[PDB]
Structures are given as structure tokens and as C-alpha cells.
């Protein structure tokens, strides 16, 4: 659309390499604000991890389906989803963390659920510390995403 030179295999390889090259230059508090902003559809694509997330979101390409699905959920089901996905931030699996962030973005794409839950999500994301889990796992996760979603 705007800003991919080549295919998504190249894009994922290249952006995952940029994340590993730059993740030490990004302060944790700034990383977490950038994650919140991505979830709320105010991406800063200059943060390579947020460019990674945006690329993965685009590759998955399920925004319309997940919107319809999330519309069918009640508040109890959404609370369950939020609590379930949030715990990934405290664990050592990056794939789950990336899934959590993207799921939260889908949920914040629903204006009722954004109104109810955006403040608490912003407050709790501020307390996470995921830089080591990104470092340790991003290259592999890039390969796993290529294998699963691309040709």
C-alpha cells in the first residue's frame, strides 16, 4: 500500500533484524507507550518493534473477521479475553505476547470496548518489561510467522 519495497518474506526478515539491532536504544517506558499507542491505532512506525507488529497485523489480515467476532461477544467474554491475553506479558513466550497485543488492538477497534477498557489497558501495559523476551525470540518468531502465513 504505502512503504513495502518487496515481498513479506523480505519485510519480516529485514524488520526483525532491525528490532534486534535497535531494541537496546529504546527506553522501556518509551517502548511500552509505543505498544499502547499501536493498540489504540496511533502507531509510531519509527519504532522497529511497532513496525514489526504492524507488518504482522497486515500479514494476518483478519481485521474484518475479528471485528465481527468481537461484536458478538458480551462484556464477560471480553473481560475473560483481556485477562487471559494480559498474562502473556508476564511470561517468556513472544508469540503469545504478539498475539496479545494484536488481540488487544482488535478489541480497541470496537468503540464500546475502547471506551470501557482503554484506560486500564494503558495503565497496566506501563508496568510490563518485555525487552528480553523480544531479544531472545524475535528472529525465530519472524521465521514461524513466515512459515504459518506466507507462501
Numbering used by the authors: 13 to 163
From the primary publication:
VACV protein A49 prevents translocation of NF-κB to the nucleus by sequestering cellular β-TrCP, a protein required for the degradation of the inhibitor of κB. Unexpectedly, the structure showed that A49 possesses a Bcl-2-like fold despite not sharing sequence identity with known cellular or poxvirus Bcl-2 family proteins. Strikingly, despite a lack of sequence conservation with known family members, A49 adopts the Bcl-2 family protein fold comprising five α-helices wrapped around a central helix, α5 (45). The A49 structure shows that A49 lacks a surface groove compatible with binding BH3 peptides and is unable to bind the proapoptotic proteins Bax or Bak.
A truncated form of A49 lacking the N-terminal 12 amino acids (A49 Δ12) was thus expressed and purified. It crystallized readily in two distinct conditions, and diffraction data were recorded to 1.8–1.9 Å resolution (A49 Δ12 ammonium sulfate and A49 Δ12 sodium malonate). Residues 13–17 adopt three distinct conformations in the 10 A49 Δ12 molecules observed in the two crystal forms (inset) and are disordered in one of the two molecules of A49 Δ12 per asymmetric unit in crystals grown in the sodium malonate condition. In four of the eight molecules of A49 Δ12 grown in the ammonium sulfate condition and both molecules of A49 Δ12 grown in the sodium malonate condition, a single residue (Gly) of the C-terminal purification tag is observed; in the structure of full-length A49, the final two residues (161 and 162) and the purification tag were not ordered and could not be modeled. Visual inspection of the structures of A49 Δ12 and full-length A49 showed that, in all cases, two molecules of A49 self-associate via an interaction of helices α4 and α6 (the “4-6 face”). In the structure of full-length A49 this interaction is formed by crystallographic 2-fold symmetry, whereas in the structures of A49 Δ12 the interaction is formed by pseudo-2-fold non-crystallographic symmetry. In the structures of A49 Δ12 salt bridges Arg136–Asp92 and Lys103–Asp139 are formed, although these bonds are not symmetric and thus formed only once per pair of A49 molecules. In A49 Δ12 hydrogen bonds are formed between the side chains of Asn88 and Tyr102 and the carbonyl oxygens of Thr128 and Val95, respectively, and between the side chains of Arg136 and Asn96, although again these interactions often occur only once per pair of A49 molecules. Additionally, we observed that A49 crystallized much more readily upon removal of residues 1–12.
